[PDB]
C-alpha cells in the first residue's frame, strides 16, 4: 500500500539559558528510525530502529553532517523570525519544520511536503505542485519572495520527488520484516454502568499496525455522531497501536448497538456485539 | 536520508 518518509524538526529558543533546543526525528510510516538531540551527549544522528543500524559509517557521518547544518539553519531562523515579528529577545519561541514524500503501492512518487510553522502557526508551506509557496501572513511573504528569487522550490524538487523516494525504497526493503508487516487489531468489548438507566459501551482495538483504523458505533442501524467518545489513536510502545470508541446508551439496548472495526489487516470489517 | 541543501528564512 501507500508509504511515506517524513522528517520532523523542532527548534526552541532558550534566552538566558543557552543555545536553542534542536530535535530531529525521521519516520517511515508510523515507525521512527533516527533522531538527533541537541541536548544529548552523542551530538550525532542516532539509529532508532534495528533495520537502520546496518547502514555503514559513511551514512551516519553524512546524516550527522547534514543535520548539524539543519541545526545551524534553524538557529539563524529563530533570530530572523524574532526580527520579522519585532519580538523581544526575552521570550521563548518555536520553529517547526516537516518535509518528506509519499508513495503509492507501486512505491512511486505520490506527494511531497516541505512546510514551516512559527509558535505553532503555519508560516510557509510548499504547494502540492512543488513549484510555489503558501505564505501564511505578510511576514512570511518576505521569506516567500526570498525563496522565489533563489529558486528554492526547483532545487527541492530533486530531493522530494527523487532522492526522498530512493531513500524510502531502500528503507522499506531493509526493514521489510517490520515496515512491510500488517498486524490485525485484537478486538474485545467492555460494559460500564453510569448510574441507573444509562450505561456506556466501549469498543477496543489493540495491537494493530499501521495506526490507520476507523471505529464506528452503529445504532440502530447506522452510525451515531452524537454521544460517541473516540480517543486519539495511541502507541502501545511495542510497535503496535491502540484505540477505543465508546457510546452512552440506556440499559437494556446493549444488543441494539454494534461496533464496526475497519483495519488494513482485517480481510473484511469486523462487527462486535455485546457480550462476547 | 535528510536534505543536504540548507537555506534560511
Amino acid at each position, epitope marked *: 500500500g501507500s508509504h511515506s518518509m517524513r522528517y520532523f524538526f523542532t527548534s526552541v529558543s532558550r534566552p538566558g539559558r543557552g543555545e536553542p533546543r534542536f530535535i530531529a526525528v525521521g519516520y517511515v510510516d508510523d515507525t521512527q528510525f533516527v533522531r538527533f538531540d541537541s541536548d544529548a551527549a552523542s551530538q550525532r544522528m542516532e539509529p532508532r530502529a534495528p533495520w537502520i543500524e546496518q547502514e555503514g559509517p559513511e551514512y551516519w557521518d553524512g546524516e550527522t553532517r547534514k543535520v548539524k*547544518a539543519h541545526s*545551524q*539553519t534553524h538557529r*539563524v531562523d529563530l533570530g530572523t523570525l524574532r526580527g520579522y515579528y519585532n519580538q523581544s529577545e526575552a521570550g521563548s519561541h518555536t520553529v517547526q519544520r516537516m518535509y518528506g514524500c509519499d508513495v503509492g503501492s507501486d512505491w512511486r512518487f505520490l506527494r511531497g511536503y516541505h512546510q514551516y510553522a512559527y509558535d505553532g502557526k503555519d508560516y510557509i508551506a510548499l504547494k502540492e505542485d512543488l513549484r510555489s509557496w503558501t505564505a501564511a501572513d505578510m511576514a512570511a511573504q518576505t521569506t516567500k519572495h526570498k525563496w522565489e528569487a533563489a*529558486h528554492v522550490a526547483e*532545487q527541492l524538487r*530533486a530531493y522530494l520527488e*527523487g*532522492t*526522498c523516494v530512493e531513500w524510502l525504497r531502500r528503507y522499506l526493503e531493509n526493514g521489510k520484516e517490520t515496515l512491510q508487516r500488517t498486524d490485525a487489531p485484537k478486538t474485545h468489548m467492555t460494559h460500564h454502568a453510569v448510574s441507573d438507566h444509562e450505561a456506556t459501551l466501549r469498543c477496543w482495538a489493540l495491537s494493530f499496525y499501521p495506526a490507520e483504523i476507523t471505529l464506528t458505533w452503529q445504532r440502530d442501524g447506522e452510525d451515531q455522531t452524537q454521544d460517541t467518545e473516540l480517543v486519539e489513536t495511541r502507541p502501545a510502545g511495542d510497535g503496535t497501536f491502540q484505540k477505543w470508541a465508546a457510546v452512552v446508551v440506556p440499559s437494556g439496548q446493549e444488543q441494539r448497538y454494534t461496533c464496526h472495526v475497519q483495519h488494513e489487516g482485517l480481510p473484511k470489517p469486523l462487527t462486535l456485539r455485546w457480550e462476547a | 536520508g535528510i536534505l543536504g541543501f540548507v537555506f534560511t528564512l
Partner: T-cell receptor, first 116, second 111 residues
Framework: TVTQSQPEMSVQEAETVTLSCTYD???????LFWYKQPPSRQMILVIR??????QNATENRFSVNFQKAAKSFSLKISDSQLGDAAMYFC???????????????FGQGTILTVHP | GGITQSPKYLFRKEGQNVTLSCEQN?????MYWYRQDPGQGLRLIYY???????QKGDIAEGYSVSREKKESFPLTVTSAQKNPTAFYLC??????????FGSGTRLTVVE
C-alpha cells in the same frame, strides 16, 4: 570525476567549435555546468543543466548537447567571435539530496584560441 | 549587489601567514573558496553553507576560514601550506543558484 580531454583548441573566427566533456557518477540526478574564464580571470556561467530536466535554450549562439546515458555534456560555440577566446570549464554537482551541496567539481579546462 | 574579493595581487614569504578577504551583499547563505592551478581545474578548499558552518575540501590542510558573519568569509593561507602558489577564487550561492565568483586573487611565494 569530470574529464576534458583537450587541453587546448583552436577555431577560426566566424566558424563553430565543439568542446567536449564527459563525467562519471552514480547519482540519478545532478547538475552540469559550463563556465567561461576569459583573460580577465573572471568566471562566467555559460549554461547549467539538470539531469531531470530536458535540454533547453538557447536564444544565444552557445548551445550544449547533453547525452545522459553517454554522460556527455559538450558545449557548442557557433559563429565564433574573438571574445570567445577564453578557458572553458566543465563542472558537475550533486542535487539537493547530496551531502556536498553545492560543491562544484571542475574539469581540467580547455583553452580556446580564436584565430582572426 | 555583488561579491568583492581582495587583494587582487599578493605574496607570501616562506613561514608567513596571510589572509584573503571575501565579502558579498547578495544575501547568499553559502560561500566557497576555490584554488586554481595550471594543469588542474578549480579545487574546493573550504565552504560555509551558513554562518558558523564549515566544510573542508580535499585540499583544506594548510588553510583556515572563519564565518562569523553572513557577508564575510575570509581565507587564511597558513605557513603550513606547503605549495600555496596559485590563483584563489571566492564564490557565493544559495544551493546551485546565483553562483557568483569574485575577481580572484594571485598569491606568490617569494623565498
Amino acid at each position: 570525476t569530470v574529464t576534458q580531454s583537450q587541453p587546448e583548441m583552436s577555431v577560426q573566427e566566424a566558424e563553430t567549435v565543439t568542446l567536449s566533456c564527459t563525467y562519471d557518477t552514480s547519482e540519478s540526478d545532478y547538475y552540469l555546468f559550463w563556465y567561461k574564464q576569459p583573460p580577465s580571470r573572471q568566471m562566467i556561467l555559460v549554461i547549467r543543466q539538470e539531469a531531470y530536466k530536458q535540454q533547453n535554450a538557447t536564444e544565444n549562439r552557445f548551445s550544449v548537447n547533453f547525452q545522459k546515458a553517454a554522460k556527455s555534456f559538450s558545449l557548442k560555440i557557433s559563429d565564433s567571435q574573438l571574445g570567445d577566446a577564453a578557458m572553458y570549464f566543465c563542472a558537475w554537482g550533486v542535487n539537493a539530496g547530496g551531502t556536498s551541496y553545492g560543491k562544484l567539481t571542475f574539469g581540467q579546462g580547455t583553452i580556446l584560441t580564436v584565430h582572426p | 549587489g555583488g561579491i568583492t574579493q581582495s587583494p587582487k595581487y599578493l605574496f607570501r614569504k616562506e613561514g608567513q601567514n596571510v589572509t584573503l578577504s571575501c565579502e558579498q551583499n547578495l544575501n547568499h547563505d553559502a560561500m566557497y573558496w576555490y584554488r586554481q592551478d595550471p594543469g588542474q581545474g578549480l579545487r574546493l578548499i573550504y565552504y560555509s553553507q551558513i554562518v558558523n558552518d564549515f566544510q573542508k575540501g580535499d585540499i583544506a590542510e594548510g588553510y583556515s576560514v572563519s564565518r562569523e558573519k553572513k557577508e564575510s568569509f575570509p581565507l587564511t593561507v597558513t605557513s603550513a601550506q606547503k605549495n600555496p602558489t596559485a590563483f584563489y577564487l571566492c564564490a557565493s550561492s544559495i544551493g546551485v543558484y546565483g553562483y557568483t565568483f569574485g575577481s580572484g586573487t594571485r598569491l606568490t611565494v617569494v623565498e
